[PDB]
Design a protein around this ligand. Structure first.
Ligand code: TPP
Ligand code: TPP
Ligand code: CA
Ligand code: CA
Ligand code: MG
Ligand code: MG
Lengths: 850, 850
């Protein structure tokens, strides 16, 4: 009889809660009272009860904790205690959880008498924190009025909440905390929670204010990651950083690393990023064993109201798809906020699960500190202007109780004002060798072309693949997969950790690498032969990710930030789906060092090639990456510097390469780690050269004394007699092979020279100038399997014309411009390719003008 | 006693349900049986019951329909009926709904007896549909084996499900259906549901198979929209199209327009787009009154296991945030699927709410028809190759029952086969005047600068704004807001519908337009002044959207497809966040007429300008838009055609404009509608020119006989004496004004000519040539307030050098290249701007070389 009523309250208590600070605007966007909650004695008929039952004593179930060292209670006691627990300033949304132990723990924490009481020292400390926050806010206001400082006015209880979280984490065992937070309230945290020299904060208020830099305090260590103004675009980055620190510190269960994130109410229910980030929480490869989310519900986004912003009651619904409990609290009552923070910290330290806490508050001023909010919401601010601040009412309550005397509070205010005034007055290298000796290469080749496990049986096709691998190894020949194994194993020997993530990377999207072997008979038997290469070596991890291209890339980037001695690779199924995560490339990878001055070295792998498989299963948009480079096309650098290659690579944002041969792909990954500094790397991997019969290289290019070749000159009869060569030809990728075959078909050998360019960013001016001067009489041309308005023409042409003294035109030999990456008609592809190949190996296509 | 048990089943039935077609892999990803379900007589102790209670008769509650014509069933009946209803081929997830009427309606359907029974005619029709689907699949397989087509084998009950849905919609009143669905099963729907000439389908299989294209059938009308391979990227487009059709057809409640969407299991739980699309559902401005989502749960994504893909149990947990009920069904049983589809159609026609139906099935072959799935999942396919197809077992069951005889079934197979081979054998203009007479302009100015409602009081600042508006109107002067009002009112007079949607558009992000007036004291009293202009006129709508930049743009794009007689505008808060919806610009607006034939005229508004607000609140990336143009920079078109302005505009893919004066903003908006055809328009609106004192124009540029000016020539003393002008200068946007000020500070009037370029795409190659020939001895230069690697230099320079016969170099006068859109230091901005003005206005920064 009573069990149904208690369940009904545990379901619908948060809907009738006075979480509203102003008293006017509602929190759940509905003022109706559902019939489940007994708002009056007339509603007992819904459960079949009546006014005669309000005095009969009822026995509590095993899922109720209001008894407090008491078994049965009069129904009036149950109703009063249940209203106090669920329908006052705290509303708990947790019964969507199917686990029983977590539900019982939450009930015990939030449904027992005499557990929320504080001590006088805690009240004094809370008063001190509230005074610090409020006086800092008014000092910023009165010393800087005509500014846009995004104030935290009408919600100062945030700072004590964060301090309570950090203190509970410290006493629970945590020794490292990583925090992410939007702009609203940044300076308060930077001055009170992550304590910093106030003179430095005042100095940085006037200059460098726009940039949200990184703040570190080192005795729990606190780090505040830099975040951009894009909303909710830094959660996966924080999760990746937390995972990397957990892995490096040896914490398998993450008992000493913690993650805290702050969100606004409007963005937590309007961005699809939160969905993707929440789905990464439980995946075995992306699980940081717990994050604490704090969402500030000021009940407004700029000038947009809550009812025209979302299709859900609360802005906290995304967290319920993963069974993460949610706590909504009224910011007016500070003790409730403190207890909720303590409960959330205990929950994270116990169950290693995400938890979200919602701070219901209001906004005292406009969106900016000089905006006019009466234009759009008159009633809201008319009601706002008739309410006391939280500090004033808290101080009055404490004075009435007798905890603090008025002179002490006044002295505290005066001394903190003097501290602020005093602070304000005071305020104003060579390229390594990447080769390997033959025994290491032979050992890796033999281990990779077999199965280490004794009774491990594989498929027949896989057996044929391994036999072909062994035949290649014994003949001193390497293909794409073998080159990948050799590079990764060589790095693993030196102690460098390697992580490879993305979609379908364990088997390969084209089924070419087979890095993970599966047993046909046993259900979960799995063998990774690479861990068996050497007795002592760095770990190796390969992971399959979800379909989100946005959260996984951010996670990988955050992981790459922790340590330089690590090789993190992200693989996309096709080069056309990277645009789903453009924001991550736009704000985090592109200007990571220009603003924020921190180093990263993530490797991005993008398959790219035109083979008729579709208008959008073809091409990786390299012209989008090539335009985001801090290089001036009109200036030719000094080509006679001490090194140039390493100096040029030092002054750039990232590197862009398009590898066609396995040897260069082997050397690039080694050069990524062996260098002193780190920079992001973008690689355009082929799609049809994996099985190509002549896409192979010998071991002689993998031996000691060999460096990565940024530009591969032409080898053949053309080089033997260079004065007779016409039509000097440049290419980048598979287009080389398609040319060479035709050069054999048309008997153009000795009349056309074809050269590749592996590295596009930065531009190799020196090597290109050296090889262009090799052929005095040859018409420069650029080949391309993409359209004119796509690919590398608009990037390469200015740089090629800069390399020479604009002494020669750079012609084009490729497809015509189009509004799509490729064509959807199979018949026209062959005609286009035949026309593309017509101009090459058929001279006088451009000499016809004269 | 029993109410708790029934409640527990209604919560946890779908977890123990036998939905798995394979007794092997699970769908909720957990094999454990929760203690709520009574799997054996020993578990009755959880509810306090025991084996002695299995025979006692228990009265049913008012929220349980098991019984039919019974009040009390003996407990052995309740348990059996509940297991049959919730734990046998059907799992219903709906109890998260808080509404009681919807819950009772759902319960009645699946929880009442003798409701799922069919008739012999229905069974015959189902057999016919299954035969058609299966024989078409095997015919495609045997006639085309070496193909990468995506096949529907494994789930062959999809076609009858869709046909049942459409039939129920037709009988419920729907007369128009819009459908979107991914590649898996496209041909089966195109050949069976949306019936099409099979010869045409066979012809398009060989050629033009790559592109999606649009399939129509007109007696319910069926439209299948084109969608790319990007997963979940076409739902908002479908919803926008549905909304537009509902609005033109006059269905306020949408009783005659319906929307159907199909999803895969892996993409419905891995993409954040679904989150935004689901929040767009209930929003009053974006409400399509229901949408029947169908998710096919084949339990595998390419080669990725469902456990390493998501954190939620089922891949349909994003629909529990909007209280949308979910039905999971086993595709083996066809009657259950048919009944579920009927129930979903009735639910949509009744409650006007979204509903999701999950068909649990398996995949018979690899991802493509020649993929090898034994490499990664051995046990799954080892079990798959030992199961009968659904058609075979259904035919055997019907033969045993006696509905159909074997000769009839064989004859049906033979006749459909013969139809298949028979089909296979058979298979093989001037620019308008946009001016207005003075009385219309005066009327719109008077109405817009005053309040229409008589008892309506506004703020004092708003009163001052309206007084300034009236002063401008009486003095024959127009600003940005007045120009917008005049354009919108002029279009509304002609009967053209106008819709403006996006973030903070009702008031304006800079509080300059005030299109919506709010009453200070009376609650919710709105007053749109432009809805009161003329006695008969088209409706006007302004909406505030959510923070999702991706879903709203897709919704607007879908809306601008239904009819040409409409002006749909999308406004962004800043030009930097548009990249969040890059995919929509990548696969839908860019190649929307090059790939599919449909035409679109959406207007995109992007604030753009460098003012020192930050590196992320400055610049709108115009160089990203300018590179996606199917224009060859190396060819100069024929400048002596009849038009060369309407012809040039006819070939392009969209238009890009940067408007500074309000008159051009008026004229371009009028020209967008008055043109015979439709093309997308991108406008770079200013931010600091809204309040600029000289950013104004007279009425003489809005009178009859005035056309939009693509290029504004240089007016002033320089034009009077053009032979004495040096440093011919090109600009685009606010920079002009700054330049003029500096010129006035340096007395360089008559020595520098500054010209704007309003239209960049199509490129004006005629007016620019004329004005370049106007000044013979003048060094061309380009002035931007953005970095050299960004902005318009890389686009404009090749086109400017093409316009002339490469006879004069195009210099640069702007900021130096950088890895970020702007700087984060306030001090360096002033130095950068001063250096920019210095190098712009001094006469030897380039001539010093000689
Ligand atoms: C992706 C994106 N992020 C940000 C903006 C601009 N912007 C900055 S703050 C803000 C309001 C966010 O609302 P809410 O989370 O409620 O913030 P609060 O009231 O706490 O400032 C918006 C829209 C934008 N247009 N697009
Ligand atoms: C955004 C994106 N879209 C598409 C792909 C490539 N792709 C095409 S179909 C497919 C499988 C989708 O899985 P599921 O939804 O289970 O569909 P099914 O295999 O049953 O068709 C993938 C990953 C990708 N990597 N990223
Ligand atoms: Ca309520
Ligand atoms: Ca289960
Ligand atoms: Mg807010
Ligand atoms: Mg699937």
């Amino acid at each position: 009889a009573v069990q149904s009523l208690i369940r009904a309250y545990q379901i619908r208590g948060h809907h009738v809660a006075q979480l509203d600070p102003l008293g006017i605007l509602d929190a759940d966007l509905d003022s109706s009272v559902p019939a489940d909650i007994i708002s009056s004695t007339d509603k007992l008929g819904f459960y079949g009860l009546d006014e005669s039952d309000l005095d009969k004593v009822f026995h509590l179930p095993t899922t109720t904790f209001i008894g407090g060292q008491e078994s049965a209670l009069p129904l009036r006691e149950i109703i009063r205690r249940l209203e106090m627990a669920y329908c006052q300033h705290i509303g708990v949304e947790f019964m969507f959880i199917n686990d029983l132990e977590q539900c019982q723990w939450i009930r015990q924490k939030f449904e027992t008498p005499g557990i929320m009481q504080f001590t006088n020292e805690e009240k004094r400390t809370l008063l001190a924190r509230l005074v610090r926050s409020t006086r800092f806010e008014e000092f910023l206001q009165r010393k800087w009025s005509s500014e846009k400082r995004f104030g935290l006015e009408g919600c100062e209880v945030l700072i004590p909440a964060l301090k309570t979280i950090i203190d509970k984490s410290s006493e629970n065992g945590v020794d490292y905390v990583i925090m992410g937070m939007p702009h609203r309230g940044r300076l308060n945290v930077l001055a009170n929670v992550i304590r910093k020299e106030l003179e430095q904060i005042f100095c940085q208020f006037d200059s460098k204010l726009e940039a949200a830099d990184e703040g570190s305090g080192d005795n729990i260590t606190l780090s505040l990651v830099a975040n951009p103004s894009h909303l909710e675009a830094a959660d996966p980055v924080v999760m990746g950083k937390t995972k990397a620190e957990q892995f490096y510190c040896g914490d398998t269960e993450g008992k000493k690393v913690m993650s805290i994130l702050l969100h606004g109410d409007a963005a937590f229910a309007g961005q699809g990023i939160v969905y993707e980030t929440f789905h990464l929480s439980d995946l075995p490869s992306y699980t940081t064993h717990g994050t604490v989310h704090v969402v500030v519900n000021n009940q407004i986004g700029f000038t947009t109201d809550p009812r025209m912003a979302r299709s859900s009651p609360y802005p906290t619904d995304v967290a319920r798809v993963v069974n993460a409990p949610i706590f909504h609290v009224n910011s007016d009552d500070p003790e409730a906020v403190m207890y909720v923070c303590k409960v959330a910290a205990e929950w994270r330290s116990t169950f290693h699960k995400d938890v979200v806490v919602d701070l219901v508050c209001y906004r005292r001023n406009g969106h900016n500190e000089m905006d006019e909010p009466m234009f759009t919401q008159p009633l809201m601010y008319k009601q706002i202007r008739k309410q006391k601040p939280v500090l004033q009412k808290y101080a009055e309550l404490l004075v009435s109780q007798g905890v603090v005397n008025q002179p002490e509070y006044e002295e505290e205010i005066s001394k903190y004002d003097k501290i602020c005034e005093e602070a304000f007055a005071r305020s104003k290298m060579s390229c390594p060798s990447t080769g390997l000796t033959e025994d290491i290469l032979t050992h890796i080749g033999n281990v990779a072309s077999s199965v280490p496990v004794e009774n491990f049986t594989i498929h027949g096709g896989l057996s044929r693949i391994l036999k072909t691998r062994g035949e290649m190894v014994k003949n001193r020949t390497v293909d794409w997969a073998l080159a990948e194994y050799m590079a990764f194993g060589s790095l693993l020997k030196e102690g460098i950790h390697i992580r490879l993530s993305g979609q379908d990377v364990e088997r390969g999207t084209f089924s070419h690498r087979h890095h993970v072997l599966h047993d046909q008979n046993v259900d979960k038997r799995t063998c990774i032969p690479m861990n068996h290469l050497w007795p002592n070596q760095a770990p190796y991890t390969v992971c399959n990710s979800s379909l989100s291209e946005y959260g996984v890339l951010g996670f990988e980037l955050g992981f790459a930030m922790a340590s330089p001695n690590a090789l993190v690779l992200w693989e996309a199924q096709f080069g056309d789906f990277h645009n789903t995560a453009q924001c991550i490339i736009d704000q985090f990878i592109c200007p990571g060092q220009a603003k924020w001055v921190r180093q990263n070295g993530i490797v991005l792998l993008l398959p790219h090639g035109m083979e008729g498989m579709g208008p959008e299963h073809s091409s990786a948009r390299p012209e989008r990456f090539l335009q985001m480079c801090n290089d001036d096309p009109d200036v030719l650098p000094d080509l006679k510097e001490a090194n140039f290659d390493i100096n040029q690579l030092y002054d750039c944002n990232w590197v862009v390469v398009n590898c066609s041969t396995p040897g260069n792909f082997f050397h690039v990954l080694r050069r990524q780690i062996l260098l002193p500094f780190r920079k992001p790397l973008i690689i355009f991997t082929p799609k049809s050269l994996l099985r190509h019969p002549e896409a192979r290289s010998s071991f002689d290019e993998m031996l000691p004394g060999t460096h990565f070749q940024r530009v591969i000159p032409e080898d053949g009869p053309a080089a033997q007699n260079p004065e007779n060569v016409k039509r000097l030809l440049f290419c980048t990728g598979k287009v080389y092979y398609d040319l060479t075959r035709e050069r054999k078909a048309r008997d153009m050998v000795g009349q056309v020279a074809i050269t590749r360019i592996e590295q596009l960013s930065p531009f190799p001016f020196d090597l290109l100038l050296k090889e262009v001067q090799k052929y005095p009489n040859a018409e420069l041309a650029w080949c391309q399997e993409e359209h004119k308005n796509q690919g590398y023409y608009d990037y390469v042409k200015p740089r090629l014309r800069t390399t020479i003294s604009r002494a020669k035109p750079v012609w084009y030999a490729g497809r015509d411009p189009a509004a799509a990456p490729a064509t959807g008609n199979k018949k026209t592809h062959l005609t286009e390719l035949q026309r593309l190949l017509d101009t090459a190996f058929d001279l006088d296509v451009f000499k016809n003008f004269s």
